[PDB]
Design a protein around this ligand. Structure first.
Ligand SMILES: O=C(O)CNC(=O)C(=O)O
Ligand SMILES: O=C(O)CNC(=O)C(=O)O
Ligand SMILES: O=C(O)CNC(=O)C(=O)O
Ligand SMILES: O=C(O)CNC(=O)C(=O)O
Ligand SMILES: [Mn+2]
Ligand SMILES: [Mn+2]
Ligand SMILES: [Mn+2]
Ligand SMILES: [Mn+2]
Lengths: 459, 10, 458, 459, 458, 10, 10, 10
């Protein structure tokens, strides 16, 4: 089979979902080591991996998969599919109002337009699994866009995006040009840029024709543009991640809580401001010599620096974690996990009644979390909530945040479980208050598809 | 026209 | 005449409104010097000033003024008037639904209930003037509440408030007890407290009988309680200010913007977080010996400290200034200021309007009506002059009033705001052309924000 | 004194507020009888009353009252005061942004502009009392606008208004022109018209110079315009009433409830529509011959006509009444009512304590409603609410609807009271269940300023 | 093959979608003639049709389809699946929080709970097709619920529903009891009822055991209850329709507009009310002998009766039509319709797209894809064609879809909507120019709203 | 500009 | 509990 | 009941 189907097959044969994600990423950038890539390339340099194996991504996505998608799925223009053109320095969009029927889409294609399909994971099970696995090692949502460009044309103007982009060339060839950030402010930019023109660009740091199987990575802020030539089309899937997952976004959540804490715990933050500070502070008093102004400025800095001591970093981490649980795509279980989870319980309906009912967990049952990135224990208003991802839709935020409450008498074993993965812990050895608690938690988690047993449960 | 959509637009 | 009517008559003779504010505060805490008060007493200790003059506040407010207010104005129970009773260690409110008529208000009073009238400045012009002047030297909104308690009783349970309080004894006598903050957290408390019981308090740092003319000052967070005894009532006015005007509130506004500017001008704040920080950061991972956790912690502390550099202090300063202007009571004008402002123009009606047509000239000498009525702030890409002249005596009844200032006048607008109270010849404004000097002056003047050395004549 | 002060003095000397309102209206249109005016002129014809007594309205309002108003009250442009100009067929408004200081207002006036002051009742106590009394005999809110026009000018373009207008000439002279409705649809129009031009008007049904003391009435829908000439100004107060108080507005509230009732009480309204009515009903099937269409139309008419039998006319009347209570201006009591109501209770604060406390009502106390148009008993969700106007602001809807609940054990006496005015009913004879009820109601009403006693209450 | 697979295979051979809807309903209630049913039975009496064929519905739905749905699709408890139990005269719901997994669903079933799956049309394509076809002949939305009850038990308490119900017995047997409305008010009830007890019911007008293939019809307002006995389960599908499609609902929309037009075109509705009607009209004035009251009453009745003349019936008709179109499930196409519509165009992908470029011509013969997919309605000052082709099988998941029709095409658009299923040559449309005939046709066709007699070729 | 205002505008 | 859901609402 | 009302809110 193809390299993609061979590695996918391997993943099924690996216990830990953490190892699974690490193994897939290793495959994605092979032969270069993930450790080198993360300590030297990630967010610092554009990276081109010439695979020299056109079959590398076979089974991931094709123009046929898209053809059958537009025809069988309800793909909507403007929402899921975008037809773009770039001619004589101007970007244009010829998006018709409505469903993207093959007749209309391919028609645009013939007219010289490029097709951009947002989040193919919402339809392709193979793309979903690919991304669903990679998100775990990114610690950040992994989305993707598919780009289809006709021969001798360019559908997009030069621009930079707000995420870390991995361009996987799936069909055809395409001449790419990646530019280093133009100015300091553009380095690792927060928001996407507008459409630029050649006159706004310097020399390319990397210019090359991509061939099926190659991988091209570049950080957010790197301007890039691509075009087809010599009578051949191009199809590629761009894997993006790390959208607004910077130190700033973290501080953005910290500060508010930190200043609130500092005020509640330290009187220096509760002291009143000067009665007349408005006499020397303000835009009109910028050009002043008053020493009270320099003292005001010094006081502000001093107070700001203290804030670090009151920062609830753990709470914010849990909230980010929680948001990442809501953002995550639902997990793709291995055959083993399935067979050992409530999802694979033998109970079904066969002749005129349900068969094999009565599967119960005992104190002897050995268990462990279905996977390492499906749930998170978060504290909110003296309450403990176990947020999970198993019930998430493949469509971003289609479903609201799912969680179940955990009582103090179970928080201890719940912690252990989230930390024991993939080690098997016997229910009887769960650190609780009573046997009723140990079976309670285990049963509640199991029935929610958040837990698996060492052996399949039998009546 | 827009560029890459990490999340699908409204 | 009484000290009050004399100091007010004295204020009407003082040129600067800043000096006028300073003088009235000097009077309010006399013989104690303002400099000492603010330096050693403000926000630090409870202060009792025994005036030894029962006429000191005569003219400010009285129970008779209360009777007329309840009778001639629409004082609403729950909103304007509160009737409270404190008995057997428990606070209770007995506000009927509807308008506060004298027959109802005095029936509660005779029933041993204490009356609290919120914001008498909205009804009484003397109180208004008092607060309107003091707010200027406070740099913060000056509110007030009038408290009336019947003989042999207590209307309120022990509590502390979220503002700096100045208690003026108007009539009668009352036994006050003031306590120093109980815990570090209660010192300069941010929010008012619940009603306490006797056993929640320790010994008083100040216990005394207040008589007409005395002043009692205590910081936010100081628990205090009072009661009437010996068969006599009590009436006092509690002047308050400094509600949420702390360095914390300032920071609360500066930080969001600080990280916003840093993220834009410094890549270090734009670097992605660790791919696995969720493995060692979080409540459950509190005891982790992971050396990466302390590194994460350290970096967070280094980034925060850096934020001071990006802090747009002046912008927030202007914002709080704009809020204080919206918060401010309308200015009380001296005869001279009125006579020289648009408010005093002789243009009236006698079958036709008389004395109309006066206009400013380049020779006209002008300056701001007062120093605490306007503020120039830039919001977005344009300039705006926020003023208080059109505010209601009722808190935030009206909306934030302002007028746009064009760049060709910004310089002149700034000068006027800072050169007070020095008159400046309109023909000497920093503006590019003559039309721009006259337009600004005319616009400001017509808004009741400017005054001239000589009355405008046609 | 002046005719206005003489009649006002008389009103104080009349018991019934109903008679008071009837007496004031009689004065307003004197010498013509109200009965003739209402059965023949009201809403049918323009009416001019040449008083031949320039002092008729003295004490009502003057240019001086306005001068001192702009100076002492907080009059805002656009909200309370409007400066209007009408030149060369075009209406213009030169409203400055902000407070209407005398300097600015009179300046506009000198520039040829007209001043319109909305609802002078909000400031003038005499205008308030005038309107507060007239609303009672109108059964509809009585508002007013004051218009001040400079010599040799016109501030407004021809137009018609959505209310019944009574123009009282207070100072100066003014040439008026009133036109009959132009078309059927314009007769008793629902909404105000735009600004018309002379070319849109026919011949005047009434053209005349008004002099101080005169009254000019015209119905909504009658186009009118006025101008000054010959070097003299004009001041007039326009009393308006009957805004959207038509049969249509009443039906507008009825229908919804009627159809809901009909559906709940009659199965014919609950039967399903034809499965295929969409085949012959619709804009595209308008030009059809299908008899099912004529049957559908006949069915609709038949059902609509039935609706009258299910109309909750009383409920809607109470709701309108209630809305009129909310709309009404607070009452102006006579010296007698005051002295006999809680408002005039002798209790005050004199030396160092309140004097004369302890006024109590007994079963012997004879009482009756303070006035006939201050309260209304309304049923809402099995509950009884006595809505009143005593706590209303002189500023329209400044205060929300005021009411007090009435329990079933008191509804009987509450009814009697509202119907006994101005007859005195002894509390002991109130039809209730217990003496506790009779004193309860009486005391609650009295203390709310909704009731008065035959004699002043004494300790 | 079974009757179902045969009638469906028969539908795929019927030209008109209207006749197709008629045939399927004819099948659903066979041998009973539709004409008799609608004339004498619809909304009047409960009807039991004993098919005497247990294979009648084979292929429509089964418990196996349910198992797969719970397993392979995201059926959510509370929203999609409901587990109910009826014991000791009391109804109870036992829905766990979360996803409906087989292990949970079957555990409740074995616990004697009944399962109710709401709107299987959103998941099952056979049910969808069934409802999509029947909605056309109902003139109203056709919904459905699948009910599965374990042996020896009752899942629901006696109740009536707010819709016309058609109960199809899919598997097993069940004891049904249907009651005629108890009171005049309950006849054709507007809203569903609460759970009743045995003593709230009288004697059944219909009591019987349903076996696979049978059909039970009963009107809204008929109380009904069922239970399983003799150790066997039950599975039925309840087809429902006619929710709030009464003359009252129609009136509910016509009246507001009626008085709105009357008030504008008839002065009598613009005349002021009486100045003192409040004296004799109102609850308290109910027993008043005031002859003015009856006059007021009479006038109100005369005015209402007049409103019929001003009623914009056609407008509301179009509005309800637009709502039915938004309410409609997407159309199920026959092979022929697909082959002749944009959906069937051979334009696919083989390194380049093949068979692309086909376009309509004036010679092209066309007609609407189906008769219940579009509606032309005027809202405001423009025309709009609302269609159902882009609707989701999930109720109101998508928003009301339409396309504006220009006046130059209104006539042609109307013709097409009415001339179905007669093909019309595009060159023969009522439009002014040739470009307008081709533009409309092309626009409609590309939207999947039109079909051609011959497949488009390039 | 407007005409008579039975109720004072916003 | 509820009865027939012509329209699944929750 | 409440305490000092720096700002009358109700
Ligand atoms: O393929 C193109 O023309 C442009 N592609 C991108 O911007 C991308 O993959 O991020
Ligand atoms: O007077 C009292 O009983 C209580 N007074 C206060 O809390 C005050 O003036 O702030
Ligand atoms: O006085 C004018 O110019 C216009 N007056 C009116 O429209 C009026 O009084 O209703
Ligand atoms: O099957 C049951 O117990 C109840 N069924 C119904 O109410 C129905 O199908 O509408
Ligand atoms: Mn890109
Ligand atoms: Mn008018
Ligand atoms: Mn049912
Ligand atoms: Mn206090």
């Amino acid at each position: 089979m193809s390299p993609l189907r061979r590695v996918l097959a391997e993943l099924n044969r690996i216990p830990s979902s953490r190892r699974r994600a690490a193994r897939l990423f290793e495959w994605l950038i092979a032969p270069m080591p993930p450790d080198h890539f993360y300590r030297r390339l990630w967010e610092r340099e554009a990276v081109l991996v010439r695979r020299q194996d056109h079959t590398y991504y076979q089974g991931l996505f094709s123009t046929a998969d898209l053809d059958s998608m537009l025809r069988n799925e309800e793909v909507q223009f403007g929402q899921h599919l975008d037809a773009a053109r770039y001619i004589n320095g101007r970007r244009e969009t010829l998006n018709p109002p409505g469903r993207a029927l093959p007749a209309a889409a391919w028609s645009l294609y013939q007219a010289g337009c490029s097709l951009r399909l947002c989040s193919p994971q919402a339809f392709s099970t193979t793309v979903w699994q690919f991304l669903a696995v990679l998100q775990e090692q990114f610690g950040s949502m992994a989305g993707s866009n598919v780009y289809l460009t006709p021969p001798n044309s360019q559908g997009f103007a030069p621009h930079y995006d707000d995420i870390e982009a991995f361009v996987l060339q799936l069909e055809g060839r395409k001449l790419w040009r990646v530019y280093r950030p133009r100015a300091p402010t553009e380095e690792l930019a927060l928001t996407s840029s507008p459409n630029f023109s050649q006159d706004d660009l310097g020399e390319p740091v990397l210019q090359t024709v991509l061939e099926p199987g190659d991988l091209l990575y570049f950080p957010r802020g790197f301007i890039h543009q691509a075009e087809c030539q010599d009578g051949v089309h191009s199809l590629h899937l761009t894997l993006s991640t790390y959208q607004r997952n910077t130190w700033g976004d973290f501080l953005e959540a910290i500060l508010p809580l930190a200043v609130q804490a500092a005020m509640e715990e330290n009187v220096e933050f509760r002291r009143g401001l000067p009665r007349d500070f408005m006499d020397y502070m303000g835009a009109q008093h910028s050009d002043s010599k008053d020493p009270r102004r320099t003292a005001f400025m010094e006081k502000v800095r001093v107070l700001v620096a203290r804030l670090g001591h009151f920062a609830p970093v753990d709470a914010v981490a849990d909230q980010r974690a929680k948001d990442f649980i809501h953002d995550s795509l639902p997990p793709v279980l291995t055959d083993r996990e399935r067979a050992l989870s409530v999802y694979g319980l033998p109970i079904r309906w066969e002749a005129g009644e349900p068969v094999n009912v009565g599967a119960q967990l005992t104190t002897e049952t050995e268990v462990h979390m279905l996977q390492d990135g499906i749930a998170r224990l978060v504290g909110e208003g003296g309450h403990l909530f176990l947020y999970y991802t198993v019930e998430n839709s493949r469509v971003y935020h289609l479903e609201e945040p799912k969680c179940l409450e955990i009582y103090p008498q179970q928080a201890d074993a719940m912690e252990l479980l989230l930390g024991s993965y993939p080690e098997f812990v016997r229910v009887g050895d769960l650190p609780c208050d009573s046997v009723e608690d140990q079976l309670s938690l285990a049963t509640t988690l199991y029935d929610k598809g958040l837990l698996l047993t060492k052996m399949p449960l039998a009546l | 026209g827009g560029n890459h959509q990490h999340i699908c637009k409204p």
